[PDB]
Amino acid sequence: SSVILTNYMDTQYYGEIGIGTPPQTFKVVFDTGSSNVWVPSSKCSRLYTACVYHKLFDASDSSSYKHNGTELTLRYSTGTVSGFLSQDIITVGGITVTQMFGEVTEMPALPFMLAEFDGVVGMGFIEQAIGRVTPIFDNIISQGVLKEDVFSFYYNRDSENSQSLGGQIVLGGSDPQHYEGNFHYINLIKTGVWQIQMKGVSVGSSTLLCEDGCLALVDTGASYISGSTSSIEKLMEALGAKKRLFDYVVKCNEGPTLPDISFHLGGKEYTLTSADYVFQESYSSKKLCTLAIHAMDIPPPTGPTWALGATFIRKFYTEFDRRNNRIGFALAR
Ligand SMILES: CCc1nc(N)nc(N)c1-c1ccc2c(c1)N(CCNC(C)=O)C(=O)C(C)(C)S2
Ligand SMILES: *[C@@H]1O[C@H](CO)[C@@H](O)[C@H](O)[C@H]1NC(C)=O
Secondary structure: OEEEEEEEOOOEEEEEEEEOOOOEEEEEEEEOOOOOEEEEEOOOOOOOHHHHOOOOEOOOOOOOOEEEEEEEEEEOOOOEEEEEEEEEEEEEOOEEEEEEEEEEEEOOHHHHOOOOOOEEEEOOOHHHOHHHOOOHHHHHHOOOOOOOOEEEEEEOOOOOOOOOOOEEEEEOOOOHHHEEOOOOOEEEOOOOOOEEEEEEEEOOOOOOOOOOOEEEEEOOOOOOEEEOHHHHHHHHHOOOOEEOOOOEEEEHHHOOOOOOEEEEEOOOEEEEOHHHHEOOOOOOOOOEEEEOEEEOOOOOOOOOOEEEOHHHHOOEEEEEEOOOOEEEEEEEO
């Protein structure tokens, strides 16, 4: 099953799922970086403007609902949400699984007032699941309907014409329609986290990063590519970029000439070009352009580490293999 994803500024990719009976529609992201499923709850106080600007799941409207009510909190790098648990059927691209999801009731304006989507569908292992709530892709594998215990992602480039698909997530395989060449898999440095071994990050002619190795989290739930303040500060100095509050910028007219950044993975350089990582809004020297690379200090047990978000996935189609604890990579198409 494949699920079309909408592209919002190269910073937000989400598809559609259906919770309840009758189905109550929800825009959600498929986050390989988390492990729970949550959606804005109808029980959320409208003092959280975020809930006023999003879709709310009501249980008094689903006959296929099963109350639980345990409270949980999902802490993300860029923001936190909170609420209680509930169970009900969920429809994801043709498949139907009964799931335990988070009915969020505390959803902060900043950042969620900037969420084009409503909730999140964790694609990570149950090992990271908060509340030990069985993840969904696990629930789907319990059906033995998928041809392969793998799911892939395809993030497109923010096109300006409503006709191109923002992206696509296939459950059970890897659509050939969007990658050329063949996949190059790397094994997970451990099962329970979609993280792998990275053998250096190079910026042109100088592997002035991740020498002696480092960790790499393949996060479809992250907008950009991140490292640790140390790593980034050093990378960001090698470009002539300036630090702001939440990102870096380089006089726009110098973006087409920034250098390549290659991420050594599994024994194959994955290279990115200025065009790949810079939001080239303008070509002037009197304006500033943002880099699709940020600093994020991911806390253990996963951190410190680099995060390979949508900036990196836009160039390389990703396959997530649950059956072999390995992540595949192919050039985007
Ligand atoms: C998709 C959930 C998610 N998963 C992980 N692993 N990390 C995150 N930082 C987020 C997470 C949380 C909140 C926001 C956010 C991402 N993003 C980035 C969206 N990322 C993608 C891949 O679509 C936003 O833009 C805000 C609305 C500010 S709020
Ligand atoms: C919620 O689900 C968990 C998962 O097994 C279960 O143990 C618990 O009893 C449920 N909560 C309640 C109060 O029903």
